[PDB]
């Protein structure tokens, strides 16, 4: 007896997301710590390009984050590669 | 002392569960408000602000 | 956009004792000249935890630049072990080549580093406090990480 | 399957970061997609890198630390 109403429990980014990136990135093990770890550095990621970009969308006087302003932001944080140009 | 990854039972990471796939339309703007982009004069004015925000940061 | 890009980072004389120098052999293409200084300089990363044990190993200034590839050789001391936390200073870490223009990091030239005991009973039984005189520093010289921010030149 | 972060609770955590910068925003679709593909491909290159560095510790198990150095290699500070 007593039927429960169901709340929206959407918050953050749960185990499979970060298992999935860390397979796509040929991880075969992790700490546990892992989890927490990751959703840390996402959320630094995110705080300082959504920043830059909010800043951008301030500039243009608009209430609307565009693609562009991301397209900024997101060179504004560095482009890592694997190897030296020449 | 980890997790392993792969991972006979590692298919159920895989799930598609279209309610969590798509975007949802709160928050979004759609399909007309102002998107015009920044020019130059707002564009540059934006990158010395941030430049000297991260001066004084 | 850039006016140098990073042709090449020879590293020499790797693996090394961790007291050794780092030595790099350096090589740029300037396509625009530069009548000011490019400073460089080399950064030990003495622990993953926070950047308060970064030690700044060197410093060199290149300048004026004029167009074309180039090459100089940057050396540095080693780190100094007192300045490293116990717990990290066997393992890997990060050193890192950077580059400014202006006071503006234009290019970080990352490689891992690993310090490792090559004697047999230390790498069974590593002492608490590290014998440095006993670690090799071997340098992961064939995965440099490159990473290029956009700067406002002149 | 290519899924990597789901979109939602990514659309949910970028509002939910985006609050406190500048309230009643909006976004474009494409600009929470060009957010999720630039934060999937930073985790997964720190991963690579992360892995790279549990390999030459002789370690099989990835630990915070190795995240931590593949941040610092990027210029994180």
Redesign the interface.
Do not use: I, Q, W
């Given at each position: 007896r007593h039927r429960k109403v169901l709340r929206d429990n959407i918050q953050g980014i749960t185990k499979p997301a970060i298992r999935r990136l860390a397979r796509r990135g040929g991880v075969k093990r992790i700490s546990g710590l892992i989890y927490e770890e990751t959703r840390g550095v996402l959320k630094v990621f995110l705080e300082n390009v959504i920043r830059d970009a909010v800043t951008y969308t301030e500039h243009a006087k608009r209430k609307t984050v565009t693609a562009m302003d991301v397209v900024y932001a997101l060179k504004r944080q560095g482009r890592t590669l694997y190897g030296f140009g020449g | 002392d980890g997790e392993e990854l792969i991972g006979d039972g590692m298919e159920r990471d895989y799930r598609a569960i279209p309610e969590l796939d798509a975007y949802e339309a709160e928050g979004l703007a759609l399909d007309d408000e102002d998107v015009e982009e920044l020019t130059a004069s707002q564009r540059e004015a934006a990158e010395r602000a941030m430049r000297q925000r991260d001066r004084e940061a | 956009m850039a006016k140098v890009?990073?042709?090449?980072?020879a590293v020499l004389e790797n693996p090394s004792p961790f007291h050794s120098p780092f030595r790099f052999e350096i090589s740029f293409?300037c396509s625009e000249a530069l009548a000011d200084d490019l400073e460089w300089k080399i950064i030990y990363?003495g622990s993953?935890?926070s950047?308060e044990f970064d030690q700044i190993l060197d410093s060199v200034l290149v300048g004026p630049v004029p167009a074309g590839r180039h090459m100089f050789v940057f050396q540095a001391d080693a780190p100094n072990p007192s300045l490293i936390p116990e717990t990290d200073a066997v393992?890997?870490?990060?050193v890192?080549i950077?580059c400014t223009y202006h006071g503006q990091?234009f290019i970080?030239v990352?490689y891992?580093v690993?310090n490792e005991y090559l004697n047999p009973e230390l790498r069974e039984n590593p002492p608490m406090k590290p014998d440095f005189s006993q670690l090799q520093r071997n340098i992961?010289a064939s995965?440099?990480?490159?990473?290029?921010?956009?700067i406002?030149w002149d | 399957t290519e899924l990597l972060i789901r979109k939602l609770p990514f659309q949910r955590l970028v509002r939910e970061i985006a609050q406190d910068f500048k309230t009643d925003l909006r976004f474009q679709s494409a600009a929470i997609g060009a957010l999720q593909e630039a934060s999937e491909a930073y985790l997964v290159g720190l991963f690579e890198d992360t892995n790279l560095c549990a390999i030459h510790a002789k370690r099989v198990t990835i630990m915070p630390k190795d995240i931590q150095l593949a941040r610092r290699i990027r210029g994180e500070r």
């Open positions: - | - | 890009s990073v042709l090449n980072v293409e990363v993953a935890e950047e393992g890997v870490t990060v890192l950077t990091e970080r990352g891992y690993n992961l995965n440099p990480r490159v990473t290029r921010f956009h406002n | -």
